[PDB]
Design the sequence.
């Protein structure tokens, strides 16, 4: 079986339960829900359908609701026709939504545009297709020198590298989508356009205000600022999502692959999950994936793409997984040890008891060869760990004591078909210490 | 300065001595001549302008002559019109070149088609565009079930994956371009579609028969059969060219990045050069490269693409090189040592004497942080060294003995601007041993 | 505190409970009863006075009954006067007990003297004071040339180096002292002159007929035959005792220090005990001790030597102990694990539960810096662990489970004064597995 | 052959040319001349017969002058009679030489006896045979309590543990002996009772005023103050000597084996020689030596002991060296490399060119398995190296260049019988660098 997890974004062509069940077989592990479109009626059904499939089949799966996030946008162009901007010429951005663009100027969805900006700064239109330096700003007008030739189409995204934009972590709508997440009880929330440590707090603050406390926050890094603040942001988050394309528009090309690498390394050390979103696939892509997985990503995600797409990502996840190796060089010490020994003894698995899922995470850090079977009485947690690499969670009634665990665990591991009589198996867990503390390890033959 | 070498394909837009002198400043290291087009006069001019540039500036550069190689193709279609192939329908291939194609059948340029093929096999037309399984074969006819919908144009490329194709090794025109090589005295010849050790032999054999004894043969791996005989192919070749696309059409997507990976590894171990040929650039590509560099390729190529392309590829070469590490875990011992010590002492350079260039290869296999400065009396060897990672060759008049070598080397090293007063410097070379044997290292302060 | 355990041979001048108490203060851990002298009343008393100081102060210590064993001896001399033997002269030994020696001949206590011997063999008189080569053998006489000048006193000890002597495993008296040992419940019996595996089985077999089943048998290695079968002897014993002087008589001087070194390593890896008997002490001696510790002996030994001797031995034991280091390169896994982590985390101690003493041992093998505190409900086992390096037993009423164990252990760890609040502490023990299997480790802060 | 060097102190019973050469055949490697006795005529003869033997057999051997050194001593007793001292009694020392002692008092040779001492101090008489506590000092007398019962004979040597005795570095006849050693050209002078760096300097100045510049100074560490300044004394000397017995009298017992262990370690690392002087032999001793070897001493010394002594000494050296192993974890890199490389390739020997003997030294530090063959034109140097571990020196005419060296060393190696056709051999040397610098290495097949 593969170990890497796959995240698909679901939609119309794929929301039926019959579709979802097949997608589960193809390899999907989490259902993404993009708040950039659709509605509460649809999404809620989408979600319902997944859960019915789960009940009907014993299959497990997480649900992640993806935030739209703040966004600046260029408006309307005369007769809806693309205009061509010439280098060195003048070009003007406006705050007035009424205004119909053309080759002389254009309106932006962002009222705060005039403010945050400054002459000297760089503006970047439509996925950085066109750069410009702000020469002037007066009233609702942003006046600039185009730095290079290009076609300005309508509704193009704007980027201001380096500038801190005063929009909120939370769009107005962004707040409503969250509540829906909590009411629905989504497992994760991938927050968009996160630039500094505060952005994570505000969503945590927000989710807490609506019963969302046990929801993991996956911060989406998408720019020079979030990149600079990554440590802080990673600190505050429950996970991370490397938005390659998005980030690619805001910084040097030779940096992207690296950023993705530093982010993943940092997440791994940190015990936090990381989703990598890159661009049959073109080979550039099939190796871009494999590389993300070699870099050690927990999960790869699939976007607007579908049953064949799944299976290919799924035969790629397996092929790259089957050749990776552990990375051995208190919870740490126990966990590393578990793994190592796991490996020395040739244990096919490593059962683990986790309430909040931390120990499965801590174990999964060393890239074990064995599958982690994680035990839990907590349902959100059982759902969440579906995101994490090599983990295979199992909700359980209870675990009375360390010895009960070992006993139970052995019954379970044997039921999983993941192990057999004579198999040695390593058990990791807590013993006389609060949650959030892994500290006991134990070998056992099935 | 980078250390990964760049290989650019030159053309009309890039042939003047003024452009070529620019491209060298941009990072180019080896001119590729693609025998796929052009003519002897142009190419020869192209080569002359490079050499002029060389004399003029003292800049060095090598010269690869890349081969067109053999192929299986589809012929003529009625009216010269594209036919529409429907899935599951029958479609027959014919050995008889006189036959004019249509929706029901088409003739291939390959007489052995019937022979090498066999029921069950997959036939792939126009770059993988359309696939077909072989149902029957009889007379000059290959009967097939068409696997998927597509349009058949004329002169389309055929590929029969897995199959051992009985075509010859060199094209007839191939034979002619090689001689021109041997007359113009190019540094390397990259053979095309190399499937088994003998194909390598045939080129060597041809090259010797016309003054080409010292030309290195870099072999292009483009399919399953070459892939499977890699060891022997590598053995007999002087180096290798990872042809990603071509490979991408012949075997599973999830394999390609792994084929490249195993190629580079085995090359480096083998002391031979490997050039990476992958698909401002889409991020996928900008990483694809870096990854190739990280996996350890000596050089990366640039095709039909131009002065900015080179520069970028440079910045990508310098940026990925600046963070790799040596890889330390008789010629070998000496060489390895030379490197670790080079490193212990903080040596900015490792002067090396080479006739055939093997010693410099030997040093480089360890991925030195230091630049390898190479001394040679042999010009072909000096040019070819350009294709090597981190190596900086220098033609020198002579070296009378181990001690002359040390003294000269010191002089040279200081002249290079590469090292200075107080810099330690390691110096490998042969001593009382035939060429092909390295065995002496000596540390020195400038 | 030192971790190496010191063994004391008790006698008249040191048997008072008063004396013993002071001896235990100075460092003594074991009471050695040399069966080569004294009588069942005196030993018994010696035993009881110890057991008394034990009850009276909670101290712990064990008692080893050292066997006299079989031996060959010269007998009576005319007028009981010492005869001077001249080099090269003739001298003969006889089997006939009635015969009274003189300068030409002497009888031996050993009837198999003629039979096991052989012309050319070396015969060693009185702690090798005089050597002699066997020149002839006829009837009950063994005719020999004298190799060196010396006086033969009566009742002299005989050594046939290299010879395989057929004496039995146990003297008739030996079987008698063994029973008393059983009656008295000593901890260990150090068997004398062990030659081959059968010797050990006889001893073991005899103790079981005596209720001595849980008595550890320690093999005394005194000659080449014993040294040859070491591995098989060690396998059947519970531990070994390196009898230096005795070995010195029986084999090449250059071999003894290395035979010692070999026996200790093998015994370590075997998880079995080894007591070191070497020859204020002479620096030679002082060093000789230090080195047995460096070689890693669990325990050293003091003979006919008394309070100052125990103390010094001890200041040397601590001196050497304080600079040793662990030795890290199922039970093994866990135990190796446990110590390493113990060391990583600064654990000043390693609690361990043991019935049989096995895991305390297992842990021990790694030469931990932390003290091993061993909890056991078995007192025999608690006594025997006194013999083990760095281990410190504690008898406990019971442990109901792994968790009961942990809670209990931390109470006891803190009470020991051996550890404090904030201190980290490793705990090993079995979980769901029979005795003889260690398999679980857990870290805990006091 | 053994690699460890042996030092034999020579005497009447061993000064004959017939006796010496037998000794060299027994294993002797340096002749120790003890200036504690004898005269200029005898010792010189003693060196004569040695040099002669060398001439007549081509055997090499070095010669060490050993210093008597300054001292404090007790004097004359009434009637030249021994007095018995009873414990707790009073006893007094006096700085007055006229006074003839008795059971109440005895004068000392050392005028600073009062000044350097202090109440509470321990005074050891006649090789520590009798301890005494200083209770008072007034005028020229040192009042003390006898610590134990014993007989005081005349002219007994005194030791003041821990005290810093202000005697000079050189006893007045010590300078004379030094001039004899210069005139006689000895290889090494072993200085006595070295306490601090300045003592080592004084002697270096004394040999220099007499053409002694090439004689290596081996400082003998006898007590606590010198053990303290060892780092600085090691620095200023050419090697050291661990005078166990004298150390054994001056500091705690558990401390000596460690002091010897620290000295040897710091010696090895410093590329300096160390002679270990420990107490058929008693096991203790035969193991004591082996341990010095295992600790890594260059050489072991023989004292007032003779042909069988050397033999056994040697057979132990072989039995020990045959089981030691290299110790691999500028000159340093090159030499470590050389060794390591030497070992990887299986070289039986490592030729080294040396003037000053240094590189023979740097190479040996690593504990090579291969014999070092050192080539030199300096005969002092060649004699000196005999003292060095595993080195085999050779005087040679000249070496014109690095290449000649290689050519020469290759003939020599094969001639030595130490290697053969097909054997690889690693050669080190200097190259374009003043003496004191090693920096070249080169592998060769014989």
Sequence:
């Amino acid at each position: 079986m593969k170990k890497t997890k796959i995240v698909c974004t679901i939609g119309p062509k794929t929301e039926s339960e019959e579709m979802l069940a097949k997608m589960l077989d193809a390899g999907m592990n989490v259902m993404r829900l993009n708040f950039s479109h659709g509605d509460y009626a649809e999404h809620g059904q989408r979600i319902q359908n997944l859960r019915n499939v789960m009940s009907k089949t014993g299959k497990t799966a997480a649900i992640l609701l993806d935030t739209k996030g703040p966004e600046i946008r260029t408006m309307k162009l005369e007769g809806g026709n693309d205009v061509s901007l010439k280098a060195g010429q003048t070009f003007t951005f406006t705050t007035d939504k009424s205004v119909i663009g053309n080759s002389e100027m254009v309106a932006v969805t962002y009222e705060g545009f005039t403010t945050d900006l400054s002459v000297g700064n760089t503006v970047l239109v439509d996925d950085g297709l066109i750069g410009m330096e702000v020469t002037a700003i007066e009233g609702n007008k942003v006046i600039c020198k185009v730095l290079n030739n290009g076609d300005l189409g309508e509704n193009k995204g704007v980027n201001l590298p380096g500038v801190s934009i005063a929009l909120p972590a939370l769009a107005e709508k962004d707040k409503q989508d969250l509540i829906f997440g909590c009411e629905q009880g989504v497992d994760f929330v991938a927050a968009s356009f996160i630039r500094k440590r505060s952005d994570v707090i505000e969503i945590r603050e927000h989710l807490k205000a609506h019963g969302g406390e046990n929801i993991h926050i996956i911060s989406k890094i998408e720019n020079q600022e979030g990149l600079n603040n990554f440590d802080e942001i990673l600190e505050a988050s429950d996970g991370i999502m490397v938005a390659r394309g998005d980030l690619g528009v805001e910084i040097p090309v030779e940096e992207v692959i690296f950023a993705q690498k530093m982010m993943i390394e940092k997440c791994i050390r940190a015990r936090k999950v990381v989703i990598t979103a890159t661009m049959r696939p073109t080979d550039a892509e099939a190796g871009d994936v494999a590389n993300a997985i070699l870099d050690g990503t927990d999960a790869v995600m699939l976007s607007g793409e579908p049953l064949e797409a799944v299976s290919i990502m799924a035969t790629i996840c397996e092929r790259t997984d089957r050749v990776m190796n552990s990375r051995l060089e208190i919870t740490e010490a126990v966990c590393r040890g578990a793994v190592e020994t796991a490996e020395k003894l040739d244990a096919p698995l490593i059962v683990v008891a986790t309430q909040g899922g931390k120990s499965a995470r801590a174990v999964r850090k060393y890239f074990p060869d064995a599958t982690i079977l994680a035990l839990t009485t907590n349902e959100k947690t059982a759902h969440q760990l579906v995101l994490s690499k090599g983990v295979v969670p199992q909700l359980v009634k209870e675990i009375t004591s360390t010895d009960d665990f070992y006993r139970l665990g052995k019954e379970l591991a044997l039921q999983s078909g993941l192990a057999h009589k004579g198999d040695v198996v390593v058990m990791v867990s807590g013993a006389l210490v609060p949650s959030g503390t892994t500290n006991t390890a134990s070998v056992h033959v099935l």
Observations:
- The longest helix of chain D spans residues 253-270.
- The CA atoms of residues 24 and 59 of chain D lie 8 Å apart.
- Chains D and A do not touch (no CB pair under 8 Å).
- Chain D has three domains: 321-443, 2-69+169-320, 70-168.
